[PDB]
Swiss-Prot record, chain B:
Disulfide bonds: none annotated. GO terms for cellular component: 90S preribosome; nucleolus; nucleoplasm; Pwp2p-containing subcomplex of 90S preribosome; small-subunit processome. It is found in: Nucleus, Nucleolus. GO terms for biological process: endonucleolytic cleavage in 5'-ETS of tricistronic rRNA transcript (SSU-rRNA, 5.8S rRNA, LSU-rRNA); endonucleolytic cleavage in ITS1 to separate SSU-rRNA from 5.8S rRNA and LSU-rRNA from tricistronic rRNA transcript (SSU-rRNA, 5.8S rRNA, LSU-rRNA); endonucleolytic cleavage to generate mature 5'-end of SSU-rRNA from (SSU-rRNA, 5.8S rRNA, LSU-rRNA); maturation of SSU-rRNA; RNA fragment catabolic process. This is U3 small nucleolar RNA-associated protein 18. The keyword Cell cycle does not apply. Interacts with snoRNA U3. Interacts with MPP10, UTP21 and UTP25. Component of the ribosomal small subunit (SSU) processome composed of at least 40 protein subunits and snoRNA U3. Present with 9570 molecules/cell in log phase SD medium. Belongs to the WD repeat UTP18 family. Keywords: Nucleus, Phosphoprotein, Repeat, Ribonucleoprotein, Ribosome biogenesis, rRNA processing, WD repeat. The chain holds residues 239 to 416 of 594 of the full protein. Involved in nucleolar processing of pre-18S ribosomal RNA and ribosome assembly.
Swiss-Prot record, chain C:
The gene is UTP5. Involved in nucleolar processing of pre-18S ribosomal RNA. Required for optimal pre-ribosomal RNA transcription by RNA polymerase I together with a subset of U3 proteins required for transcription (t-UTPs). It is found in: Nucleus, Nucleolus. Present with 33100 molecules/cell in log phase SD medium. Interacts with snoRNA U3. Interacts with MPP10. Component of the ribosomal small subunit (SSU) processome composed of at least 40 protein subunits and snoRNA U3. In the absence of snoRNA3, forms a complex with other t-UTPs. This complex can associate with pre-18S ribosomal RNAs. Belongs to the UTP5 family. The chain holds residues 298 to 347 of 643 of the full protein. This is U3 small nucleolar RNA-associated protein 5.
UniProtKB/Swiss-Prot annotation, chain D:
This is U3 small nucleolar RNA-associated protein 15. GO terms for molecular function: U3 snoRNA binding. Interacts with snoRNA U3. Interacts with MPP10. Component of the ribosomal small subunit (SSU) processome composed of at least 40 protein subunits and snoRNA U3. In the absence of snoRNA3, forms a complex with other t-UTPs. This complex can associate with pre-18S ribosomal RNAs. Present with 358 molecules/cell in log phase SD medium. The gene is UTP15. It comes from Saccharomyces cerevisiae (strain ATCC 204508 / S288c) (Baker's yeast).
UniProtKB/Swiss-Prot annotation, chain E:
Involved in nucleolar processing of pre-18S ribosomal RNA. Required for optimal pre-ribosomal RNA transcription by RNA polymerase I together with a subset of U3 proteins required for transcription (t-UTPs). It is found in: Nucleus, Nucleolus. Present with 6560 molecules/cell in log phase SD medium. Interacts with snoRNA U3. Interacts with MPP10. Component of the ribosomal small subunit (SSU) processome composed of at least 40 protein subunits and snoRNA U3. In the absence of snoRNA3, forms a complex with other t-UTPs. This complex can associate with pre-18S ribosomal RNAs. The chain holds residues 321 to 384 of 896 of the full protein. This is NET1-associated nuclear protein 1. Signal peptide: none annotated.
Length: 86, 171, 50, 493, 64
RNA sequence: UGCGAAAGCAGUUGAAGACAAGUGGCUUGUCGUUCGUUAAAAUGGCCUCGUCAAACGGUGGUACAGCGUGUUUAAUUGACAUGGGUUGAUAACCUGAACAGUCUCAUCGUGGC
């Protein structure tokens, strides 16, 4: 259930969140990577946000929100974001 | 003269630290007691001696803050899920750190710690941090007065040791 | 005159003192001091049962 | 902040006939052994000194049993007629046995082949032989000659004292446990005589009139002695020549007594009594010789004993029956380099100035219902109630904790047919008891309040409700007729 | 009294505080004490407040 | 709400104003608004500080249950390096200064394992 963010160069963890209660099957992001959405077998969709200017200048995601919308699982998640569609 | 010759130790001496200012030497080992010796040349005597029951100690450190240099804590810890902190006052007021603030799975033993100084970098306020070496690659850094988990640093592999470097920036 | 101040070291190097009216004590006088030997660390913020 | 209070197990008002500490201690004498003897077990003595062996006198043999294996370690079979009494000396070193031909033979214990001396007492059968309890070298033998004799075991030719005076069949001796000059003897005419041995000795100093023919006399204090004979036993203060208790709690004649002091027990002293009808009972000398526990055996019990005061091991109660068998009930009781590396772990702060202690004590393990009530899993706590291996007071206390604490309805919300049947199937059993039936009443009332439609659908809990109806019908007939008995003795005030 | 680690949203609790917390605040320069006001509302006939600071190290009630 | 006993016995539930929604009004509903009357819901639940084993003393119903043995009327001792790593879908295995004073081990011989 843990969701981790890793610096690519230096190949190493920046921060770990203990978000879900069971596996995280699928996670996705938006265009400018201000949000990361994530979901799995415990059937909640978590949202990790970095939209604040301090968040962007400090590289610090926060565990922003959490929604319970699905009945059994979430096995697939995806995002689209355009001028008249997000 | 052998420093603990005045009062013998009942175990192998696992850690050993001088005071930053005073002529004091703190020894400690697996017989779960820690002894302070006023050292000099001739007669290294025993200042005081504290026996923590059920808590063999493996690392013991004199911490002395940078703000007022008047705290004089002793942080001590062994293969336990807690770490003691004696506040030196010459009864003895010691506190126990036993809460990783959400991070108990990655820190199952407080053996390998180190104490260091940290600056707030928006105020010029320093405070001591203790740094615990945990299981996966984890170093859990936490406040030396409140015990609050400040941050954690994970390396990739089997963490074996670590050290603290400082570098000045300005006045 | 009638007053005697003796000195010892309580911890390793810190001197402690005692005043005595030496004219009215007995000949073989044994001063008793309270000194930590095995005392359970009674913290003031906790009762005896922990 | 505090620690969490433990879930208190629901204790009701206590019912009559609770388990006393005396009867808990005397009830853990178990694992009975029945050893069939050749004839009726008449006497049984214990070794005093290493108080760990006992001699059983059957007919024409005396067997020493061990108090750790309960088998015959050693046996004494070279008697010509029926051997009657067999006791150990106070040092536990040698063993005297009176025989039906009036030949006291004393061997040494733990060596049946060396008969040490054979006192030729009266031509009549010698029925009781015991050494002095203070002195070591005098042996008191009474016989069917109506005269007891004190023998010095050095001069074993003439008796050093001849205590006569009794009119019929002296069957018991006893010595008084602080004054060593004082021998209390008991005969089949009643009349416990007792003798000062510095005097003539042909006359008792006084006599205690037990009215029945006495079977045994033992000494409890240095002052008071207890004589059994007939259906009762009486106790006698000896400094004042005067009876002060009598207990007649048997059907037939009390055959024997013995007494225990200072042993590891809630009872500080204990007199046990064996009484020809099957019963051996234990009486407590400190509250007025009241009976505290008893055993019933498969025939008339002829003699009994217990392990002595300093037994230090496997402790025994033995009773030999007139049927010819013997019943025993017992209560039982890395590298030098690595150690040099891990040396200090056993030090515990002796020479150290301050000694800090904040290791918390480890409490009892929480059961699953208690940790589920702690974790606020209230339906899981109900499920953990109705497992099969649960105590009835434990099911009751988790029902009562869910009743007082939160909501019966919360604990019962998500249920259906298959998950209510444990509750109602326990409520059948709990409706009978007084202590459970209030809780069973409101739990059944709530579950039929909020599952009245599942009543319609499922037929396989309709029948459970019908069985519950007949249960409450039986219980309401019982609770009505109890009120009728209550009135019918309210009439008799 | 819960304290939320706002980085990982991780609670540390202190659960049985003989009164509801109607005020809580950090107190020291380094934040080594928490001061709390506990309203103790089992009696409805009076508003009886307990003042409880506690050291933040081992979360023990220093000076209630 | 009042009088009460723990049963019960008498009383109910108005008005103003503002705002919100729906279709300037009309309807409905609210109020960190006033006057008068004795008058269900935001997936959102409780910390670590050492476990395990075996006893013992009381207490309930002796395998059952519970409290205690830090001082108490009474009654407790012992194991464990309270870690790290690899599998494991609890365990096994590896590992940290883990053979060796009653010195341990190797090798070549001598005499009788």
């Amino acid at each position: 259930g843990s969701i981790k963010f890793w610096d690519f160069q230096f190949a190493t963890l920046n921060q770990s969140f203990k978000a879900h209660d069971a596996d995280v099957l699928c996670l996705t992001t938006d265009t400018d990577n201000n949000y990361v959405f994530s979901a799995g077998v415990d059937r909640k969709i978590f949202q990790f946000s970095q939209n604040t200017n301090k968040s962007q200048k400090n590289n610090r995601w926060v565990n922003s929100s959490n929604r319970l919308l699905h009945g059994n699982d979430i096995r697939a998640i995806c995002a689209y974001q355009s001028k008249g569609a997000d | 003269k052998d420093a603990n010759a005045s009062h013998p130790s009942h175990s192998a001496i696992q850690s050993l630290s001088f005071h930053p200012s005073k002529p004091l030497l703190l020894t400690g080992g697996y017989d779960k007691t820690l002894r302070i010796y006023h050292i000099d040349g001739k007669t290294n005597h025993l200042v005081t001696s504290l026996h923590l029951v059920g808590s063999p100690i493996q690392t013991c450190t004199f911490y002395t803050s940078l703000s007022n240099q008047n705290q004089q804590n002793i942080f001590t810890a062994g293969r336990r899920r807690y770490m003691h902190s004696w506040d030196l006052s010459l009864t003895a007021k010691i506190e126990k750190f036993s809460r990783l603030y959400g991070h108990e799975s990655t820190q199952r033993s407080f053996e390998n710690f180190k104490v260091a100084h940290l600056q707030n970098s928006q105020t010029n306020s320093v405070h001591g941090i203790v740094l615990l070496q945990g299981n996966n690659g984890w170093i859990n850094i936490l406040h030396s007065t409140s015990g609050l988990w400040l941050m954690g640093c994970k390396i990739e592999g089997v963490i074996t040791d670590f050290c603290i470097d400082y570098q000045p920036i300005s006045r | 005159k009638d007053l005697l101040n003796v000195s010892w070291l309580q911890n390793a190097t810190m001197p402690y003192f005692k005043n005595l009216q030496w004219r009215e004590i007995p000949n073989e006088y044994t001063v008793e001091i309270s000194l930590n030997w095995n005392n359970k660390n009674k913290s003031a913020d906790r009762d005896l049962h922990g | 902040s505090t620690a969490r209070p433990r879930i208190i197990t629901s204790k009701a008002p206590l019912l009559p006939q609770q388990t006393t500490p005396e009867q808990r201690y005397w009830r853990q004498y178990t694992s009975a052994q029945l050893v069939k003897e050749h004839n009726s077990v008449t006497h049984i003595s214990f070794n005093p000194q290493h108080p760990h062996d006992f001699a059983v006198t059957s007919s024409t043999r005396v067997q020493i049993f061990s108090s750790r294996t309960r088998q015959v370690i050693k046996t004494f079979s070279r008697f010509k007629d029926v051997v009657y009494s067999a006791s150990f000396r106070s040092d536990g070193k040698l063993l005297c046995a009176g025989d039906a031909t009036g030949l006291v033979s004393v061997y040494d214990s733990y060596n049946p082949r060396t008969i040490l001396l054979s006192i030729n007492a009266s031509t009549h059968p010698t029925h009781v032989t015991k050494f002095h309890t203070q002195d070591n070298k005098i042996l008191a033998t009474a016989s069917d000659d109506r005269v007891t004799r004190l023998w010095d075991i050095s001069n074993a030719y003439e008796p050093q004292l001849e205590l006569t005076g009794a009119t019929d069949y002296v069957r018991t001796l006893s010595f008084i446990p602080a004054a060593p000059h004082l021998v209390a003897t008991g005969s089949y005419d009643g009349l416990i005589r007792l003798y000062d041995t510095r005097s003539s000795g042909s006359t008792p100093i006084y006599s205690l009139n037990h009215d029945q023919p006495v079977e045994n006399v033992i000494a409890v204090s240095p002052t008071q002695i207890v004589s059994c004979g007939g259906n009762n036993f009486k106790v006698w203060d000896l400094t004042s020549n005067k009876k002060l208790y009598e207990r007649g709690n048997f059907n037939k004649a009390v055959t024997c007594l013995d007494y225990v002091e200072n042993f590891d027990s809630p009872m500080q002293s204990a007199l046990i009594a064996s009484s020809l009808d099957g019963h051996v009972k234990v009486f407590d000398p400190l509250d007025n010789f009241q009976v505290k526990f008893g055993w019933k055996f498969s025939g008339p019990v002829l003699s009994c004993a217990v392990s002595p005061s300093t037994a230090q091991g496997n402790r025994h109660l033995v009773a030999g029956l007139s049927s010819g068998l013997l019943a025993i009930r017992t209560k039982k009781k890395k590298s030098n380099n690595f150690q040099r590396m891990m040396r200090g772990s056993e030090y515990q702060g002796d020479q150290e100035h301050i000694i800090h202690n904040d290791k918390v004590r480890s409490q009892r393990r929480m059961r699953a219902f208690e940790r589920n009530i702690n974790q606020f899993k209230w339906s899981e706590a109900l499920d953990n109630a109705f497992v099969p291996g649960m105590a009835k007071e434990l099911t009751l206390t988790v029902l009562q904790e869910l009743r007082k604490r939160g909501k019966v309805r919360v604990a019962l919300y998500g249920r259906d047919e298959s998950t209510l049947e444990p509750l109602l199937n326990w409520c059948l059993k709990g409706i009978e008891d007084v202590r459970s039936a209030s809780i069973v009443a409101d739990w059944v009332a709530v579950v039929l309040e909020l599952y009245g439609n599942t009543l319609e659908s499922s037929p396989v809990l309709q029948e459970l409700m019908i069985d519950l109806k007949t249960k409450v019908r039986h219980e309401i007939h019982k609770s009505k007729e109890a009120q009728r008995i209550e009135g019918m003795l309210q009439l008799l005030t | 009294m819960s304290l939320w680690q706002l980085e990982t949203n991780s609670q540390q609790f202190l659960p049985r505080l003989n009164g509801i917390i109607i005020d809580c605040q950090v107190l020291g320069p380094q934040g080594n004490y928490y001061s709390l006001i506990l309203q103790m509302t089992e009696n409805n006939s009076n508003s009886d407040y307990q003042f409880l600071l506690l050291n933040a190290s081992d979360l023990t009630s220093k000076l209630s």
